Ligand binder design. Structure first.
Ligand code: NAG
Ligand code: NCT
Length: 355
């Protein structure tokens, strides 16, 4: 099991001012550390944050968190469930900032909610340095859905943080699961009359202002003031990243359909789905390490059945293992790192998750 630690710096808080924290399972004699960012949408104004606080409160507060958590999938310590990194030090960072891990704005007389996701990550890293992370060889910052996009937004800041603190030996890497989305499937990109039908790019624009959100510096310098929302989209922020990042992305992500307002399928829907898979495949063509199955699904890496999905005969744990080998101080025979399905329809891959 992973054991809860609430941050000693109680000024780095969840949305409601309760302390943020992390679940930790130490593995003495391992110099590999996996920090997993939980996902779970976001809120972007007072009214829909209030709604989230009423019926999704564990995503906004630590008050009701359990003392322990069971590590599953890539967080499992059993080699059967986790052929990749079962012996690693395991950290699960709960998502309680509702800001796609981008916020740097505390509560006050003007802010009723605190949005500190980017600061929570930095504070967890700081505390872990005193619990063995100072001796690490690899820190893998992983995450699913909003946590996957969180990886893209934060992996280079963790690398810079560890360099400035005097730990240049730790190799910081990223693993972004279901965090890679397209912004091009919209009739209107700026209308936001209600929360549910708000355009995805407009929701992010509003969120960034509400959260005092921060994006990676090289990406921010490209798109400049007011256009930081661009850096939430993988194909725009990825080329600016210096840290190695492995991208896990279903070709037909259920959250992509949701932000596109897409729910016997006829020609219009068939063309949308087939074009979506082709466009996602195209955006991944120059990502060196990726795993992108032709499935309609959402998230994978902390699901116990993540061992079972295969692309071109290679499982996700094996792909990550080959990625590890590729980064040890020319492709590898029988150990591929770039695995993107070419077939054009959900479940054309027979290993897709069911239900
Ligand atoms: C707590 O975190 C805040 C935000 O990063 C920082 O400004 C402050 O110096 C920290 N204080 C301590 C005691 O760690
Ligand atoms: C960051 N989120 C994860 C799942 C969907 C993604 C997203 C991207 C852009 C606008 N809203 C949500």
């Amino acid at each position: 099991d992973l054991r809860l630690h609430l941050l000693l710096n109680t000024s780095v808080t969840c949305n409601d001012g309760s302390p943020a924290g992390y679940y930790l399972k130490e593995s003495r004699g391992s110099r590999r550390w996996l920090l997993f960012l939980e996902g779970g949408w976001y809120c972007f104004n007072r009214e829909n944050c209030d709604s989230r606080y009423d019926t999704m409160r564990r995503l906004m507060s630590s008050r009701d968190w359990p003392r322990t958590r069971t590590g599953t999938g890539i967080l499992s310590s059993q080699p059967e469930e986790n052929p990749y990194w079962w012996n690693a030090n395991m950290v699960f960072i709960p998502y309680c900032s509702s800001d796609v891990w981008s916020g740097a704005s505390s509560k006050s007389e003007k802010n009723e909610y605190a949005f500190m996701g980017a600061l929570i990550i930095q504070e967890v890293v700081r505390e872990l340095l005193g619990r063995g992370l100072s001796g690490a060889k690899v820190l893998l910052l992983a995450g699913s859905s909003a946590g996957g996009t969180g990886v893209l937004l934060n992996v280079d800041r963790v690398a810079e943080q560890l360099e400035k603190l005097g730990y240049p030996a730790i190799q910081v890497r990223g693993l972004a699961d279901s965090g890679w989305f397209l912004d091009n499937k919209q009739y209107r990109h700026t209308d936001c009359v209600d929360t549910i039908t708000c355009a995805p790019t407009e929701a992010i624009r509003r969120g960034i202002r509400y959260w005092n959100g921060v994006v990676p510096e090289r990406c921010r310098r490209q798109f400049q003031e007011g256009e930081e929302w661009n850096c939430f989209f993988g194909y725009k922020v990825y080329p600016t990243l210096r840290s190695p990042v492995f991208v896990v992305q279903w070709l037909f992500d259920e959250a992509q359909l949701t932000v596109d307002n897409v729910h016997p399928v006829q020609e219009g829907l068939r063309l949308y789905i087939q074009n979506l898979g082709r466009e996602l495949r195209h955006t991944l063509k120059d990502v060196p390490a990726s795993f992108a199955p032709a499935c309609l699904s959402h998230e994978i890496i902390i699901r116990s059945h993540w061992t079972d999905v295969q692309v071109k005969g290679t499982s996700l744990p094996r792909a990550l293992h080959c990625w590890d080998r590729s980064l040890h101080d020319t492709p590898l025979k029988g150990c591929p790192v770039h695995l993107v399905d070419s077939c054009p329809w959900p479940h054309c891959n027979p290993s897709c998750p069911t239900g």
